[PDB]
Amino acid sequence: ISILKDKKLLIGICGSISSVGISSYLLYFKSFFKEIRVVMTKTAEDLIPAHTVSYFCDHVYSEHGENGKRHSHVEIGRWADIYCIIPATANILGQTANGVAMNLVATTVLAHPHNTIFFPNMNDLMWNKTVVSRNIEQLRKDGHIVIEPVEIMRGLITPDKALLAIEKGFK
Amino acid sequence: ISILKDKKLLIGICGSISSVGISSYLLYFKSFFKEIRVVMTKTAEDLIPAHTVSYFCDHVYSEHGENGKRHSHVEIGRWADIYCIIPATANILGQTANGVAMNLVATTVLAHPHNTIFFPNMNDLMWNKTVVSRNIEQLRKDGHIVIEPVEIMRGLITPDKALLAIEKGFK
Amino acid sequence: ISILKDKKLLIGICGSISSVGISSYLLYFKSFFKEIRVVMTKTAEDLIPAHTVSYFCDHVYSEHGENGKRHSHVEIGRWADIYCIIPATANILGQTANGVAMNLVATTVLAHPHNTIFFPNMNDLMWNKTVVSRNIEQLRKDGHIVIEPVEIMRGLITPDKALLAIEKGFK
Amino acid sequence: ISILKDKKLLIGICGSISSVGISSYLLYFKSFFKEIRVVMTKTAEDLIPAHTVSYFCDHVYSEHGENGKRHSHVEIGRWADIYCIIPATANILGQTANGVAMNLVATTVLAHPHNTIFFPNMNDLMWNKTVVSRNIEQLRKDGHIVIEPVEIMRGLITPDKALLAIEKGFK
Amino acid sequence: ISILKDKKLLIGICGSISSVGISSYLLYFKSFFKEIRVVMTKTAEDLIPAHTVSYFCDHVYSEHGENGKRHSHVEIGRWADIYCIIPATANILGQTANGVAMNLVATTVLAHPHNTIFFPNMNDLMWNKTVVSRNIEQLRKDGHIVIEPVEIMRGLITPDKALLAIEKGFK
Amino acid sequence: ISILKDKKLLIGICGSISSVGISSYLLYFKSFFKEIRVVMTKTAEDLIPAHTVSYFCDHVYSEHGENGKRHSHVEIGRWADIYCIIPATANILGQTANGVAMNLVATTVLAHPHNTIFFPNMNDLMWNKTVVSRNIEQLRKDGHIVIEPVEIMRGLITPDKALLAIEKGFK
Amino acid sequence: ISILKDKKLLIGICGSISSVGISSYLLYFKSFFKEIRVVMTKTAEDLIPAHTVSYFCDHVYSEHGENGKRHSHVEIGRWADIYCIIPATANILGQTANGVAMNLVATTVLAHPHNTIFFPNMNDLMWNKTVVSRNIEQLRKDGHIVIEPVEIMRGLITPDKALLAIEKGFK
Amino acid sequence: ISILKDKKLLIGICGSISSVGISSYLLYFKSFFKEIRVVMTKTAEDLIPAHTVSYFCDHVYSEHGENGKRHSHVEIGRWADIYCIIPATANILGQTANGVAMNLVATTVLAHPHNTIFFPNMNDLMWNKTVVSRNIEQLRKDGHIVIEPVEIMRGLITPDKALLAIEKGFK
Amino acid sequence: ISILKDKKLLIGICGSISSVGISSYLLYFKSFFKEIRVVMTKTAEDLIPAHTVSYFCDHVYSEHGENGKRHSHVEIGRWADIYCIIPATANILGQTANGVAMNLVATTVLAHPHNTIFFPNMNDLMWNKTVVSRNIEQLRKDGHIVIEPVEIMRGLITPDKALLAIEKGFK
Numbered sequence A, B, C, D, E, F, G, H, I: 001i002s003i004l005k006d007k008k009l010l011i012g013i014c015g016s017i018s019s020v021g022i023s024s025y026l027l028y029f030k031s032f033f034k035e036i037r038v039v040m041t042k043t044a045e046d047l048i049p050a051h052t053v054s055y056f057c058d059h060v061y062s063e064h065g066e067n068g069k070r071h072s073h074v075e076i077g078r079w080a081d082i083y084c085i086i087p088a089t090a091n092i093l094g095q096t097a098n099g100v101a102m103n104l105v106a107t108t109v110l111a112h113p114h115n116t117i118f119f120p121n122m123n124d125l126m127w128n129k130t131v132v133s134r135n136i137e138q139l140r141k142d143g144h145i146v147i148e149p150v151e152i153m154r155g156l157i158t159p160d161k162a163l164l165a166i167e168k169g170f171k
């Protein structure tokens, strides 16, 4: 676990209501990694502004770029030692599973030297769809890790569990 | 057939010249269902304004949301008892077949509890492409229904045929 | 080779730094074909303006349309005798391989009567990703041609090689 | 406590990083009150969009109005049985303590028939300023309730404590 | 009363539904003063356009300035012999009572050589709030005049009463 | 005096014609402090652009933020060792005296660990108003310093006097 | 010197940091001339707003016109008895010296009946450039006056010196 | 004269009140040349819209380009057999005389294979300025023709005279 | 040649089709200098975006400034040890030759301590114009270097030749 203290973590945020709570993960991970940055999708930004998310991490890469210049997928892909997408949408799973990259989050997956760990989150109806399962499987077959969501009173596993999943994957 | 009189129908409209005539289907289906709403893709709206389509149905969900707020896929997906996409583009077929959802129409497919019935419509050159056929097949294997288009002096089957196809699928 | 002098060539440009140099190919191909036009993706235009690219070819079809009217994929797809996408992104490969068409470049592939020849270009990390290779293969299995990039002091083969690849494919 | 199940609760959100987590309070209070609505200040909206906050309550009144029409302070002030401002800024405390109302949140305080319960939240440096304390006192002397923040590893008391404070004040 | 025929009157209009009827006062005062001008707050303008109010007086100073240049508080403050704010909001009372000036109306109070006469108007709930009364008192202690509103089938006293109140104050 | 050479100075500029000459103070103070930054109010910026003021200091914090993100009051408040507002408006005096903070300048006063030194500047009519004097007094009672303006052929004391006043206050 | 008390003075302001202090000259000249107006270049306005400069003179002619109508060079050129450009940029010197007039300031020089007096101000590197000297000379040969800048702890001569230079030139 | 019936004429219009009457020349020249097009400067367009001028000639090239693409100076310069600038401003004379080209009109002069004939028009004060005369001379020395303006109850010579001047120059 | 490895190079890009290929020079010069930055004219940016050019150098100064603030000519002029304009337009030659500076590129020439080396590029018709030659000569007489263009199957000399020309001039 102490091995991460000197690693660069990139968190890709996708469109989900649970993204609004991303600070819980972000603040918890702050003490375990060397540096943490974020890359968001358009839907994620509409839910929670990139400027808001910047109060909980070192830098936020927006799909809209900075001053009209699109951020570099190869630069952020190489910059990061670990790329974790949380939360991941059915869409992002479908795009990455099939080599499609219509936004920076999906593009970065292809440009990151290592495999990507996904933390899916979606409506139960969506979660039980054949394609999603097929997509998840395909990603695994391809080498990516897919932390399953947990049922609750479905959702993401608490920051601590998530941290452990990140550490385990980094092998 | 009289079983539908008490069902909620959601029609997803995609980018096609034939969308301009969607009122023919919409007005014909009005007497057979409890309520009919529409969800459109951006290209469909550029061809025929959502406000225009609203004169032929109960409500139109736009990709652009309402007052800047994106409409809910889980809400419209659950709201509807039957989700029928007419006309369906090669694009929508390719997205749904592979679990990709870059617009509300494709997302709703994943968020609807039941399977979706598709009414493809495209250029003959496009229709004969290997991928399209593979995509259509994959959708069927996945459980979705795909009403084939008919050749004419290719296109969609008249409102009456279409209605029958909807009724048959609802089993 | 002299057979091309009377053929219409459509070049689809995708998002890559190498697109900035597209005039080298465009000007070189000018003497071998009857007429050459271009169709670009949004990212390609942000890198090199459609108006700039218009100084090196007969016409440039933008994703943004002309006067707010989207250009026709069936019209440009049929207009062209040969459709060559250079440079091709992982994204375009992933979209075309799976029958997804979210931009004019990918849509045109489905609307062109013949198969399309692709000239991929991307970061080496991206090039070695499993999905890309799978996508490339799938395109070949589907009938499309995929000119591989070459390593250099990876990139596109010079205009002359490329021309030859176009001629060979036209059979 | 069961007396609240039939009361209308209005929550005024002000500019604070802690506003991003307002769903925790909002969702927790949902089962104890008849209906819950929100009224926000401009700074609060820049941090967390009104549309986001609308996924956790019945309605959100923005400073920007609805379709260009400013929402009514007398209407929302009278509509609500209980008006609770959480989180409250030094600014809102200073405005309300002195009868100044430059935004809907502060105006509503004057237009609500009953007294308002405040849940201050600010930087410790700000919290120890003479004026703030004087303002807090003045509000109390005026009849308003001011739930003090708690020190932690200062902040707002958990949703449950807060609920209790609301119930106690409603007397 | 005939002493006013040669005095310059400045009327500050604040945000209130009763501002819509300001012409009644404005037209009635036209024959008793040398010249009458108006200065409005943003809320007042949203209710009744400055251009509308200009049909009932000699000039209207807007918070938005003229051609992007903010109007001068010292110039309008000195220009006027009598400065009367009707209708006055709880907000304006709170700002002036405490030396705060966030808009031209409140700023002018500080820049006018003489004391200002206020004609408050607000919701009864607001009128009975402790702070308002304290603010009104403070203004009086400071030297300003505050014409109380009258109950009706609360509101402003008719133009004629108001005129008398202006004359009495001018001593 | 040489004690300041290693202190961080923050200058808050408010809306006054005298702000146009702020470079005289800014350039004079440059050799006595470790670093000097500025924070402006909206009115100050309309008079003299933040970009202009940036040619005479190390950084200028605008009310409008940077790239749409509001600057941090706690960050700039803590960053600075000494916070001096010159020129200070009646408005800023009224806001700070009463714990109201509707702009960054006033907010920073509450977020700065130490007391703030004010250099008021306004029209003589405004200066002789009861509220202003009461506000000035209240600020002093609260611990803030208020350098009075001087009459001239009223205004701010020359840069040199001002520097001395800063040094004296820093005790 | 008393001869000027009845003359119209037009001051053209160009792009220079020293323009920010133009009020020193403007206010000093106010008592010696019948009336003083200003005409600015775009760069000068970006440094110090035309509305700001209007507080120190009778009228400011902007390059942007008034309500979209370009101000008249012949009207302002004829209106003025004396046209003095302070500060003058290398650019304005180069334009006027060569009969080029791309902005109102340079155009007015050609439209003014009399010769123009220039008060150059620029970086020392720029001042020592061959072209500038040649341009200055050419202007003199043409009849215009060019008050040289003075070295200091280069810059413009104080308002008083400048006034004298204006008086001397008016012969 | 009949030699022109088969020549392409390009008329460059500059900023002058007399440009408003350009149709008189344009319509008169229509029967003597093969084709007539126009190229305008920004000031000319503000006086008389390019669309207006298009009712009196075959095509109008605007400084603003067409659909955001700047028109080609080499294309229009080569297209035309004769390039005549009427009316010509002091500015255009100064730019062309010195090899400066900040707008399409001046640039075209350099890109036209042949010499350009100018029809100056300006205020008499401007016309008597040394630089203008020097500029006119320089243009002649360079090979360009400069039809002098005539005094009237100064202005341009009637369309007929102008036509003759064009014919004479074409040798 | 190895003397340059520790020098700062500023490249000014002007409006020319050949600017699109500027990366060839930029990338080639990267290994010979300490650092390379670019300053562009408006026309150059319309042809090839500043963000594009930023992928081939350390920084790009735009005429439009950064965040609305114009970049400093004295700062970039002094920053650079060598200032080379490639490609140079007839316009830039005409402006610099005559001491006119209407854009940052031309202004920087005057603000750079040393002489500037120009690499002209234009249409042959333009190149043979008397004024251009006169302008080129004048620049030389003034001390600037002007690398002539070469005829080809006219244009700029390859990056390697250009590098040599830079080295030779640096003496």
Ligand SMILES: Cc1cc2nc3c(=O)[nH]c(=O)nc-3n(C[C@H](O)[C@H](O)[C@H](O)COP(=O)(O)OP(=O)(O)OC[C@H]3O[C@@H](n4cnc5c(N)ncnc54)[C@H](O)[C@@H]3O)c2cc1C
Residues within 6 Å of the ligand: A013, A014, A015, A016, A017, A018, A041, A042, A043, A044, A047, A063, A064, A088, A089, A090, A091, A092, A102, A103, A121, A122, A123, A126, B063, B070, B071, B072, B073, B101, B102, B103, B104, B107
């Ligand atoms: C409140 C809410 C909660 C949701 N929660 C989930 C969830 O938990 N799980 C799930 O699988 N789906 C969820 N969705 C749906 C999901 O957002 C959609 O399927 C979406 O199409 C894909 O989201 P994304 O984040 O993967 O990609 P995105 O890239 O954000 O794509 C979606 C939208 O982005 C726009 N877009 C992309 N790039 C740009 C650009 N450069 N400029 C302008 N627009 C651009 C598209 O036009 C489209 O409308 C939610 C939607 C909403 C509105």
Ligand SMILES: Cc1cc2nc3c(=O)[nH]c(=O)nc-3n(C[C@H](O)[C@H](O)[C@H](O)COP(=O)(O)OP(=O)(O)OC[C@H]3O[C@@H](n4cnc5c(N)ncnc54)[C@H](O)[C@@H]3O)c2cc1C
Residues within 6 Å of the ligand: B013, B014, B015, B016, B017, B018, B041, B042, B043, B044, B047, B063, B064, B088, B089, B090, B091, B092, B102, B103, B121, B122, B123, B126, C063, C070, C071, C072, C073, C101, C102, C103, C104, C107
């Ligand atoms: C007149 C016309 C008729 C056509 N008929 C057919 C047909 O019969 N069959 C067929 O298969 N194809 C047809 N097409 C092509 C099809 O529209 C394209 O393949 C398109 O890319 C996909 O269309 P869609 O409706 O599936 O999806 P869409 O979601 O409409 O995607 C297409 C366009 O939507 C834009 N877009 C998506 N979300 C947003 C957003 N939030 N904001 C802004 N833009 C957004 C994209 O940028 C893109 O240009 C037609 C095109 C035109 C112009």
Ligand SMILES: Cc1cc2nc3c(=O)[nH]c(=O)nc-3n(C[C@H](O)[C@H](O)[C@H](O)COP(=O)(O)OP(=O)(O)OC[C@H]3O[C@@H](n4cnc5c(N)ncnc54)[C@H](O)[C@@H]3O)c2cc1C
Residues within 6 Å of the ligand: A063, A070, A071, A072, A073, A101, A102, A103, A104, A107, C013, C014, C015, C016, C017, C018, C041, C042, C043, C044, C047, C063, C064, C088, C089, C090, C091, C092, C102, C103, C121, C122, C123, C126
């Ligand atoms: C400088 C640079 C160089 C790159 N080089 C490569 C490379 O060599 N190889 C590679 O595989 N990838 C490369 N990429 C990444 C690639 O651009 C991304 O994966 C992109 O998402 C897909 O590009 P595209 O050209 O295939 O499609 P695009 O259709 O251009 O999709 C990408 C962007 O287009 C927007 N978009 C689509 N339609 C519209 C519309 N109608 N209106 C507004 N926005 C629209 C999307 O919202 C999205 O941000 C590069 C990116 C940058 C910034």
Ligand SMILES: Cc1cc2nc3c(=O)[nH]c(=O)nc-3n(C[C@H](O)[C@H](O)[C@H](O)COP(=O)(O)OP(=O)(O)OC[C@H]3O[C@@H](n4cnc5c(N)ncnc54)[C@H](O)[C@@H]3O)c2cc1C
Residues within 6 Å of the ligand: D013, D014, D015, D016, D017, D018, D041, D042, D043, D044, D047, D063, D064, D088, D089, D090, D091, D092, D102, D103, D121, D122, D123, D126, F063, F070, F071, F072, F073, F101, F102, F103, F104, F107
């Ligand atoms: C990330 C962040 C966190 C903060 N956390 C705290 C905190 O915990 N506690 C605290 O006391 N302060 C906090 N502040 C500071 C506080 O936001 C400021 O003092 C602010 O001036 C007052 O906030 P408000 O919510 O009370 O009022 P607001 O009404 O939001 O006033 C602040 C801003 O609103 C603008 N505004 C008001 N009405 C409109 C309108 N109709 N249109 C456009 N703009 C309008 C103003 O111009 C001003 O910039 C924070 C600021 C930031 C940027």
Ligand SMILES: Cc1cc2nc3c(=O)[nH]c(=O)nc-3n(C[C@H](O)[C@H](O)[C@H](O)COP(=O)(O)OP(=O)(O)OC[C@H]3O[C@@H](n4cnc5c(N)ncnc54)[C@H](O)[C@@H]3O)c2cc1C
Residues within 6 Å of the ligand: D063, D070, D071, D072, D073, D101, D102, D103, D104, D107, E013, E014, E015, E016, E017, E018, E041, E042, E043, E044, E047, E063, E064, E088, E089, E090, E091, E092, E102, E103, E121, E122, E123, E126
């Ligand atoms: C229909 C209606 C009727 C009302 N009637 C009363 C009443 O009778 N009595 C009463 O006490 N209150 C009344 N109010 C409420 C009162 O308008 C609010 O308290 C308001 O915040 C203060 O109003 P004002 O006129 O004093 O000041 P204002 O200066 O108008 O302040 C209110 C609004 O002005 C905006 N604002 C200020 N300056 C600018 C600027 N330069 N640019 C853009 N926005 C600016 C603020 O952001 C804020 O939303 C009413 C509100 C409405 C909508």
Ligand SMILES: Cc1cc2nc3c(=O)[nH]c(=O)nc-3n(C[C@H](O)[C@H](O)[C@H](O)COP(=O)(O)OP(=O)(O)OC[C@H]3O[C@@H](n4cnc5c(N)ncnc54)[C@H](O)[C@@H]3O)c2cc1C
Residues within 6 Å of the ligand: E063, E070, E071, E072, E073, E101, E102, E103, E104, E107, F013, F014, F015, F016, F017, F018, F041, F042, F043, F044, F047, F063, F064, F088, F089, F090, F091, F092, F102, F103, F121, F122, F123, F126
């Ligand atoms: C040329 C001139 C000189 C002046 N000189 C003095 C003087 O010497 N002394 C004095 O006491 N008063 C002076 N005033 C008046 C003073 O500017 C007003 O009282 C003002 O309301 C308060 O100024 P401020 O700088 O304290 O605050 P500000 O915060 O600048 O408040 C004033 C204006 O700011 C706007 N504003 C605030 N935040 C935002 C935002 N985020 N977006 C958009 N608008 C916003 C308001 O709507 C309002 O119009 C002057 C006014 C002018 C026009």
Ligand SMILES: Cc1cc2nc3c(=O)[nH]c(=O)nc-3n(C[C@H](O)[C@H](O)[C@H](O)COP(=O)(O)OP(=O)(O)OC[C@H]3O[C@@H](n4cnc5c(N)ncnc54)[C@H](O)[C@@H]3O)c2cc1C
Residues within 6 Å of the ligand: G013, G014, G015, G016, G017, G018, G041, G042, G043, G044, G047, G063, G064, G088, G089, G090, G091, G092, G102, G103, G121, G122, G123, G126, I063, I070, I071, I072, I073, I101, I102, I103, I104, I107
């Ligand atoms: C902070 C600063 C200080 C400077 N100080 C000096 C100095 O002391 N001496 C000196 O010689 N140079 C100085 N310069 C440089 C000088 O501003 C430039 O050479 C400039 O190109 C010419 O300035 P001008 O005032 O003569 O003309 P301007 O007419 O202001 O020309 C410069 C800018 O004006 C724009 N412009 C002109 N008309 C319009 C219009 N109608 N609409 C939109 N834009 C228009 C141009 O596009 C160009 O960017 C300074 C620049 C800056 C940024």
Ligand SMILES: Cc1cc2nc3c(=O)[nH]c(=O)nc-3n(C[C@H](O)[C@H](O)[C@H](O)COP(=O)(O)OP(=O)(O)OC[C@H]3O[C@@H](n4cnc5c(N)ncnc54)[C@H](O)[C@@H]3O)c2cc1C
Residues within 6 Å of the ligand: G063, G070, G071, G072, G073, G101, G102, G103, G104, G107, H013, H014, H015, H016, H017, H018, H041, H042, H043, H044, H047, H063, H064, H088, H089, H090, H091, H092, H102, H103, H121, H122, H123, H126
């Ligand atoms: C009603 C009127 C009549 C006039 N009559 C004459 C006359 O008879 N003779 C004479 O010599 N002068 C005359 N002038 C003055 C002349 O217009 C000015 O000297 C002007 O600066 C040069 O005009 P132009 O047509 O040569 O060039 P222009 O290129 O039109 O230059 C002038 C204006 O163009 C703007 N401009 C240039 N390119 C662009 C662009 N791409 N986008 C936006 N703005 C741009 C500049 O910023 C500047 O304000 C007149 C001016 C007016 C207002």
Ligand SMILES: Cc1cc2nc3c(=O)[nH]c(=O)nc-3n(C[C@H](O)[C@H](O)[C@H](O)COP(=O)(O)OP(=O)(O)OC[C@H]3O[C@@H](n4cnc5c(N)ncnc54)[C@H](O)[C@@H]3O)c2cc1C
Residues within 6 Å of the ligand: H063, H070, H071, H072, H073, H101, H102, H103, H104, H107, I013, I014, I015, I016, I017, I018, I041, I042, I043, I044, I047, I063, I064, I088, I089, I090, I091, I092, I102, I103, I121, I122, I123, I126
């Ligand atoms: C595709 C193309 C290729 C060309 N190739 C050459 C060539 O090889 N050689 C040659 O000598 N000429 C060439 N030209 C012509 C040259 O661009 C024109 O003479 C131009 O007027 C001067 O270009 P510049 O780069 O020197 O200056 P620029 O400063 O770019 O001046 C030209 C344009 O800039 C605008 N402008 C300047 N500052 C601003 C500002 N702040 N905001 C908005 N607009 C501003 C003007 O209004 C004007 O339209 C070409 C033109 C085009 C369209």
